[PDB]
């Protein structure tokens, strides 16, 4: 029992929000009040979890719940 739904968990911790407020097509900036620097740290957090490097212009334009999960699958 582990899915791959923690990306939700990680985002939750980093942005300090309640797990239900994380919802697949929820945007980091526009909905979860993440900024400039929050973005940087969350990408990092997605690497500590889930041993995988994410290249700079790969990991940018990620930006919504969806595309974090999407990227990590097959990685």
């Amino acid at each position: 029992s582990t899915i791959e739904e923690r990306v939700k968990k990680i985002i939750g911790e980093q942005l300090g929000v309640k797990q239900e407020e994380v919802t697949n097509n929820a945007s980091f900036v526009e909905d979860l009040g993440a900024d400039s620097l929050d973005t940087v740290e969350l990408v990092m957090a997605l690497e500590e979890e889930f041993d995988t490097e994410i290249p700079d212009e790969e990991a940018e334009k990620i930006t919504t719940v969806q595309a974090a999960i999407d990227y990590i699958n097959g990685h």
Partner: protein, 407 residues
Amino acid sequence: AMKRAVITGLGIVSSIGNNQQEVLASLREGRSGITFSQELKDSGMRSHVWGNVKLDTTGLIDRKVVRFMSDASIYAFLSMEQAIADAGLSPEAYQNNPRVGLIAGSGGGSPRFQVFGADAMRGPRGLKAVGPYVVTKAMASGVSACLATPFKIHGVNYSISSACATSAHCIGNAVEQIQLGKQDIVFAGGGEELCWEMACEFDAMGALSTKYNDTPEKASRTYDAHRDGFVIAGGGGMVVVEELEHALARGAHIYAEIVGYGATSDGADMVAPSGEGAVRCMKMAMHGVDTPIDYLNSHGTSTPVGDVKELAAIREVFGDKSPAISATKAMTGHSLGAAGVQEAIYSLLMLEHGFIAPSINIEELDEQAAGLNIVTETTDRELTTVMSNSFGFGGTNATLVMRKLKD
């Protein structure tokens, strides 16, 4: 006529208490805040004793704010929260206000996070492992930057740094801002992290106590014949410095007026104090103060070199009419940058509650400390005027004189 400055609120996180009540109890009892430290021992240091903060700070501060903070900023932030509540200031009163400012600093920024940053960079992940928050934690102005932003400060905003005199100069500068008519309120204070990264640098100098590791509470022992250096400590403190008419009229509670502020330089020895600089400093603070000094919180770090020089300077200033003297660092250890503001707070409690805290652990009084009224037992007395000395490396000196308001 020139503007006057008073303290209308305070807050403190120290080795002998996490607020002014806990500190008040520790001060009256002469309780040590010093303990043994595994961290210092495991690092390879000769000094294994600590003036640590006894508090889990986890979750005390909002995520978006603490993400920028080192421990110095955290202690200072928590002290400021106390000071704000204690001054009876509401958000509307001090936030988004061009005449409200903040002057707070540390002695050494954050060695811990500067080292953390270098390790991450030199590790397998390099730049990816560092994160975007090391600068704000490590830079020298961290304490002032990490506070002025969440507290919506609009007035003056920077850090004074002067080693172990840091937060004393911060308070003096806050006073100058009021005197110049630029600010109505200035939050002044400081913080210092406690870590082997910084402590070892002092140990390599031979500045730290090493012969009393088995009996931590006996290690800091100012004026004792067998003292062997200071006990490093951490913590924070903040005081609300306010223009007189602004404070009286909003019905603020006033602890004391700051009637004197001295700031001088030795221009002599880098790490050893000279008598002449301290004498000029104390005299500068006492100038135009018509009452006598009832109590003096001495810098007194418990070093062989430092303690007797300060006493010699005191003798020269007062002669035969010396005031009562105690060194609270014997209980608290040496908070470095936070020492000035914490010791100012201790002096303000002594002034507010009418007692003198003891200078403890003096088993054998030093030959050169003779006839100077050094207090060793808690003593109730009605005080009116008190003095606090802070000295730092580079021969930098600071003195504050505080006195009860009349009527």
